[PDB]
Coordinates of N, CA, C and O in Angstrom, one line a residue:
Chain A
X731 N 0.8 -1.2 0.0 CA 0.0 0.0 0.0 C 0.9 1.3 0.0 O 0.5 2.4 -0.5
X732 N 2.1 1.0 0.6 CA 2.8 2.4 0.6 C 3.7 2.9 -0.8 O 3.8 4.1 -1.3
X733 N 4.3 1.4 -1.3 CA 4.3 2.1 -2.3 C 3.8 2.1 -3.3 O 4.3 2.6 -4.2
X734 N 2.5 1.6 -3.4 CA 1.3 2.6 -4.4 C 1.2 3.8 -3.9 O 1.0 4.5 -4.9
X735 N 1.3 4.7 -2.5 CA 1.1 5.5 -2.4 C 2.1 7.0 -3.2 O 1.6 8.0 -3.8
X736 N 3.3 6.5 -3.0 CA 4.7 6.9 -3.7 C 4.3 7.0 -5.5 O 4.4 7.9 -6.3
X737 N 3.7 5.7 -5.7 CA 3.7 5.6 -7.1 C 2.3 7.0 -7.5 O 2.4 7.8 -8.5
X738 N 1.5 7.0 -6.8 CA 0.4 8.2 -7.1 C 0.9 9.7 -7.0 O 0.4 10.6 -7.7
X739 N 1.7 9.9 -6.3 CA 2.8 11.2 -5.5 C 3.5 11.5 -7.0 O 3.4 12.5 -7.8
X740 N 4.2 10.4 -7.2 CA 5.5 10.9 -8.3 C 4.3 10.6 -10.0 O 4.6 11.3 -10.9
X741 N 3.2 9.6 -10.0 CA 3.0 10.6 -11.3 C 2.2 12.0 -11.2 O 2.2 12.6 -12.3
X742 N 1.5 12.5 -10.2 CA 1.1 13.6 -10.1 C 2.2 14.7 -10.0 O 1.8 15.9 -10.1
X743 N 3.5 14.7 -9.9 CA 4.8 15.4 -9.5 C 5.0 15.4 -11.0 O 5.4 16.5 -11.5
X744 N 4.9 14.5 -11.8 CA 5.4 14.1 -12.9 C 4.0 14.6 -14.3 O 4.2 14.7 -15.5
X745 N 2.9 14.8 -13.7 CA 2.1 15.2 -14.7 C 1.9 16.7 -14.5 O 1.2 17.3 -15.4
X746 N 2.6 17.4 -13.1 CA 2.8 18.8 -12.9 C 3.9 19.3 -13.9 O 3.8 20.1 -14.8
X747 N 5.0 18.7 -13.7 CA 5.7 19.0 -14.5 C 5.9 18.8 -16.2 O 6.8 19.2 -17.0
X748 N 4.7 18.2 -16.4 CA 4.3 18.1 -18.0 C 3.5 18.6 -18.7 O 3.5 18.6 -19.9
X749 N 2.4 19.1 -17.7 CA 1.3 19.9 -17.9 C 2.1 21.5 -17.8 O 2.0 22.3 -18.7
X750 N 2.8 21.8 -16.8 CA 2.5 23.3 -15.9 C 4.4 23.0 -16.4 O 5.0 22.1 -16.9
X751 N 5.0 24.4 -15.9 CA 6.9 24.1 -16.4 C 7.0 23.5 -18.2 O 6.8 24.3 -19.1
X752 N 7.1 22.8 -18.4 CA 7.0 22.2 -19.7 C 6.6 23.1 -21.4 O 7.0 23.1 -22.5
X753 N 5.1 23.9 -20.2 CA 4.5 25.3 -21.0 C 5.7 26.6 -21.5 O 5.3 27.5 -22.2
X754 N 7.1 26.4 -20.9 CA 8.3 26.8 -20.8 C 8.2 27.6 -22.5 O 8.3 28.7 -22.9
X755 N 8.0 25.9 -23.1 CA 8.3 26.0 -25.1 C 7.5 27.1 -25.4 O 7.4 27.2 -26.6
X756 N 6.9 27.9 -24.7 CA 6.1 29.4 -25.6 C 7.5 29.7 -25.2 O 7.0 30.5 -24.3
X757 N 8.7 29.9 -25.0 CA 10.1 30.6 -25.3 C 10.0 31.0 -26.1 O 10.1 32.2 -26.0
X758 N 9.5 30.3 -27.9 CA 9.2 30.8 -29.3 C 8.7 32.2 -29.3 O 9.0 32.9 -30.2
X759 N 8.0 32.6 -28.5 CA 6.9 34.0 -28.4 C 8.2 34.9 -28.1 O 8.4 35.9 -28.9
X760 N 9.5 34.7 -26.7 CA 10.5 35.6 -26.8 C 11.1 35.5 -28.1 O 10.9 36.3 -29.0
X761 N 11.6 34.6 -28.2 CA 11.9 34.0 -29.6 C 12.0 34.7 -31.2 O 12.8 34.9 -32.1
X762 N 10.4 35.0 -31.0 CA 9.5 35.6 -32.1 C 10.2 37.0 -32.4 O 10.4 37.5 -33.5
X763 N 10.7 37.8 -30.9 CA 11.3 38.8 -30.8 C 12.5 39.0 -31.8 O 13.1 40.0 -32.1
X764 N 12.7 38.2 -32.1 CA 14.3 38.8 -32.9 C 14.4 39.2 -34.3 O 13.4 39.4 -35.0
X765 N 15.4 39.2 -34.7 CA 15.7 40.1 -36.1 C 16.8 39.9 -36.9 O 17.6 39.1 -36.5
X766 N 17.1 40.5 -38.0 CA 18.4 40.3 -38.8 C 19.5 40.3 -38.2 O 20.3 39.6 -38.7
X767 N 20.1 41.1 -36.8 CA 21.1 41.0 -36.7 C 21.0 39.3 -36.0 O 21.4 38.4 -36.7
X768 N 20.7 39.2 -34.9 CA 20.6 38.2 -34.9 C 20.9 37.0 -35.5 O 21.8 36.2 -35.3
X769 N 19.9 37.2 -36.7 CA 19.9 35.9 -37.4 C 21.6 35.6 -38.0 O 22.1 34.5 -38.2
X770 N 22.2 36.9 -38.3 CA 23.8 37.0 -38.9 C 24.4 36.2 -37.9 O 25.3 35.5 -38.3
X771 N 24.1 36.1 -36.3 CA 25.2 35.5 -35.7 C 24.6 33.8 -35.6 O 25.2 32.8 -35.3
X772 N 23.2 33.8 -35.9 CA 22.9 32.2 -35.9 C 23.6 31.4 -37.4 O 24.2 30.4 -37.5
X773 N 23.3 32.3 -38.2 CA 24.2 31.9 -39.7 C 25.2 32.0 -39.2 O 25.4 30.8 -39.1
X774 N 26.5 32.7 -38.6 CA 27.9 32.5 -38.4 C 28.2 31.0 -37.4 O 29.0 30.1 -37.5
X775 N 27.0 31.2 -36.5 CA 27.1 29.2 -35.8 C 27.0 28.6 -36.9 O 28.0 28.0 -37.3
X776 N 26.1 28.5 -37.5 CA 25.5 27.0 -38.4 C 27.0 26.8 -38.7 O 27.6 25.8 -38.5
X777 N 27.7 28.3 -39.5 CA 28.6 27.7 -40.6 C 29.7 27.2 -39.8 O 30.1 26.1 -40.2
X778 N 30.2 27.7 -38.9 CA 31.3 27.2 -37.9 C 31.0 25.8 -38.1 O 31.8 25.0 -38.5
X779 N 29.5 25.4 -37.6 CA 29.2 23.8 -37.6 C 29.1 23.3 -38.6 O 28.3 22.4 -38.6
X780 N 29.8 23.5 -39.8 CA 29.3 22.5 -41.2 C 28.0 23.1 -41.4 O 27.2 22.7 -42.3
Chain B
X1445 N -17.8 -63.2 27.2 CA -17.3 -62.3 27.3 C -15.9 -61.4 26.9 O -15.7 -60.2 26.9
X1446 N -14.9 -62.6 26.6 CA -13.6 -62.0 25.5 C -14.1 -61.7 24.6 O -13.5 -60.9 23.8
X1447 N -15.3 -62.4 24.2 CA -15.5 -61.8 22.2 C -15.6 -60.4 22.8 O -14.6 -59.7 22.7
X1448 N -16.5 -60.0 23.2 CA -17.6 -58.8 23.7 C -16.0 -57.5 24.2 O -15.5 -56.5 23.7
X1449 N -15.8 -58.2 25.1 CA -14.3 -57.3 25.3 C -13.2 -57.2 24.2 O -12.7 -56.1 23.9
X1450 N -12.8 -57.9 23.7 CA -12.5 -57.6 22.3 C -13.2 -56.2 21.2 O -12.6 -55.3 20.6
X1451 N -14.4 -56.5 21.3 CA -15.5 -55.7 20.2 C -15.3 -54.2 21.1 O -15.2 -53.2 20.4
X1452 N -15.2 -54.1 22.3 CA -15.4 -52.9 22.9 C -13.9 -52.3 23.1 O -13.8 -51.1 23.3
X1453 N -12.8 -53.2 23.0 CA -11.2 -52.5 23.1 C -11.2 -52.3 20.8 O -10.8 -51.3 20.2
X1454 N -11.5 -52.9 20.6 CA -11.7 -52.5 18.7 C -12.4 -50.8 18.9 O -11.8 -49.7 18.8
X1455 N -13.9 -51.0 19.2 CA -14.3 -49.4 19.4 C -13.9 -48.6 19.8 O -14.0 -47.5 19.1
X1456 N -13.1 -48.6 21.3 CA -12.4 -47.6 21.5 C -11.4 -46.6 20.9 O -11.1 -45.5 21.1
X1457 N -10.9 -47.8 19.9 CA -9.6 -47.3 19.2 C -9.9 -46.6 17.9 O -9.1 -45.8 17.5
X1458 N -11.2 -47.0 17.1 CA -11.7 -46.1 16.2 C -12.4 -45.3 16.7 O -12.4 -44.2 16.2
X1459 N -12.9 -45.4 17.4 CA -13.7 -43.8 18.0 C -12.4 -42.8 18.4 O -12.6 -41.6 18.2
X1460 N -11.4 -43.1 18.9 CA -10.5 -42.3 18.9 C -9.8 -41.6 17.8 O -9.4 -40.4 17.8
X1461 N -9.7 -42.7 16.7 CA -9.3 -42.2 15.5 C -9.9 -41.2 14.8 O -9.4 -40.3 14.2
X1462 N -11.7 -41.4 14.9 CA -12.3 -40.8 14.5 C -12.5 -39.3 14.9 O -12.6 -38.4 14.0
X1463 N -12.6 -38.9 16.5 CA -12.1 -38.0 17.2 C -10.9 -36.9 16.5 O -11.1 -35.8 16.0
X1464 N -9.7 -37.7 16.7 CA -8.7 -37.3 16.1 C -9.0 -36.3 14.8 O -9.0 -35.1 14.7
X1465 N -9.0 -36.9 14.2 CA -9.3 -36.0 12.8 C -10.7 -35.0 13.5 O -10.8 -33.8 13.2
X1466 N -11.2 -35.3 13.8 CA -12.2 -34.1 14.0 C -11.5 -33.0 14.5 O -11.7 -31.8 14.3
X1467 N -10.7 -33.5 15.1 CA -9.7 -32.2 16.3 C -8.6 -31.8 14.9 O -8.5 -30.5 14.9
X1468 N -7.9 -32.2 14.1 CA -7.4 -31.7 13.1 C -8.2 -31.3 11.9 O -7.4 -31.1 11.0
X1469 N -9.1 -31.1 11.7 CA -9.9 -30.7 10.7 C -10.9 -29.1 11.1 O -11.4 -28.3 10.4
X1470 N -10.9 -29.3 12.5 CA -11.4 -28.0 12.9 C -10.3 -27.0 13.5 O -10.6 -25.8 13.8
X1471 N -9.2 -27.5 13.7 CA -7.7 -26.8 13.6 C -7.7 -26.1 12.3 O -7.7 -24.9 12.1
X1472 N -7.8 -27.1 11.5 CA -7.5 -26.2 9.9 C -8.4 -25.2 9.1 O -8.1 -24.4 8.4
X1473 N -9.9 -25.6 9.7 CA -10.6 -24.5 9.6 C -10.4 -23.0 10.2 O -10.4 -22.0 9.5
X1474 N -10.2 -23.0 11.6 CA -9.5 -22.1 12.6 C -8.5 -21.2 11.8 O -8.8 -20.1 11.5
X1475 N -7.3 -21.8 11.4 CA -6.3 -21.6 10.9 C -6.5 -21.2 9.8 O -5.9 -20.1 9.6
X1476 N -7.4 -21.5 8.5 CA -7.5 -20.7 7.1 C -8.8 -19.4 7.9 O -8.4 -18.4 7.5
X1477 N -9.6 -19.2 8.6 CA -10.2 -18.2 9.1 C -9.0 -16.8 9.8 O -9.0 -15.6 9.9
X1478 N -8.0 -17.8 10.2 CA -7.0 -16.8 11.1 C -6.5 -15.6 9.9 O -6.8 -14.4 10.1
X1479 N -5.7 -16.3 8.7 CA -5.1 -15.8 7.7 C -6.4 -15.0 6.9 O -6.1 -13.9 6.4
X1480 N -7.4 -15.4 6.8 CA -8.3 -14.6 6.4 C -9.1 -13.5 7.0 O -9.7 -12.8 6.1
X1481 N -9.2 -13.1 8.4 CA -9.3 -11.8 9.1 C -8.1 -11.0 9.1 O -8.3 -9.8 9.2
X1482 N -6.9 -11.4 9.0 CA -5.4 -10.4 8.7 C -5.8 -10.1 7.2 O -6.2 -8.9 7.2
X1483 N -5.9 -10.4 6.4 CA -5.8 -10.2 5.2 C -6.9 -9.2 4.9 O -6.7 -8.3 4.1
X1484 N -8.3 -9.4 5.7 CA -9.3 -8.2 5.0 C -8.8 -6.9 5.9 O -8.8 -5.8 5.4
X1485 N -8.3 -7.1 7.4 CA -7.9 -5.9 8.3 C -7.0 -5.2 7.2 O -7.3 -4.2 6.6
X1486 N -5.7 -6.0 6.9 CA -4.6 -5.0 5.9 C -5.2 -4.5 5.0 O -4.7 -3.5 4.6
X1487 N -6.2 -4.9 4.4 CA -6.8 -4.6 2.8 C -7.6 -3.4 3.4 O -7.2 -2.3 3.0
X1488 N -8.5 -3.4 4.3 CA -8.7 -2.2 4.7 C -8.3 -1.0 5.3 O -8.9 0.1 5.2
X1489 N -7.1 -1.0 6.0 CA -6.3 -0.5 6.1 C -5.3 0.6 5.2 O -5.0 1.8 5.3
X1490 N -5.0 -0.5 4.3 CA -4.1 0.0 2.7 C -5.0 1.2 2.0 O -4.6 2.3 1.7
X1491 N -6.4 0.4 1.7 CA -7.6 1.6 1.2 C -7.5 3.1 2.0 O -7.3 4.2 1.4
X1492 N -7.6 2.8 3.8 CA -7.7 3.8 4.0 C -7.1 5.0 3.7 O -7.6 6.1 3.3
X1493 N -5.3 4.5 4.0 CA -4.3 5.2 4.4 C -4.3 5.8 2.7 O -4.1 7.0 2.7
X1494 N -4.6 5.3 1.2 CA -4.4 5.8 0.2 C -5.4 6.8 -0.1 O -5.2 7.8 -0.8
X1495 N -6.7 6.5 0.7 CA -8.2 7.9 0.5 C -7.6 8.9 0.7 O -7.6 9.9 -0.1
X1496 N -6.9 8.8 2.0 CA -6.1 9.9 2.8 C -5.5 10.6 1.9 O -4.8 11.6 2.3

């Protein structure tokens, strides 16, 4: 019984963190914020990387 | 009279036998009832403490 109890605890801990935190990925919306200069130093990564 | 005493030392010893097993057969009843009141106490118990 106790650890079903444990087992109900951690997926509720685990469906907070998937539902609620997780909502993080609207980063895109700061994201959305940017512009040409920018984009020149993401082109200067890529090519660094192949 | 030896037949007769004969017939009555024979009964005694199956009526004993018979006895016997009564006294182990209602042991074993006892004993599967024992394991069977622990088992519904914990089951209700476990329910509780998870409502909680």
């Amino acid at each position: 019984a106790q650890a079903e109890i444990e087992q109900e605890l951690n997926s509720v801990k685990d469906a907070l963190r998937a539902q609620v935190g997780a909502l993080a990925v609207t980063g895109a919306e700061k994201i959305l914020g940017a512009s040409i200069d920018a984009n020149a130093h993401e082109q200067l990564v890529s090519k660094l990387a192949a | 009279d030896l037949e007769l005493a004969h017939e009555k030392a024979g009964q005694q010893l199956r009526e004993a036998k018979a006895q016997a097993a009564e006294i182990v057969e209602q042991a074993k009843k006892r004993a599967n009832q024992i394991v069977d009141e622990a088992r519904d106490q914990a089951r209700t118990e476990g329910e509780r403490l998870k409502a909680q």
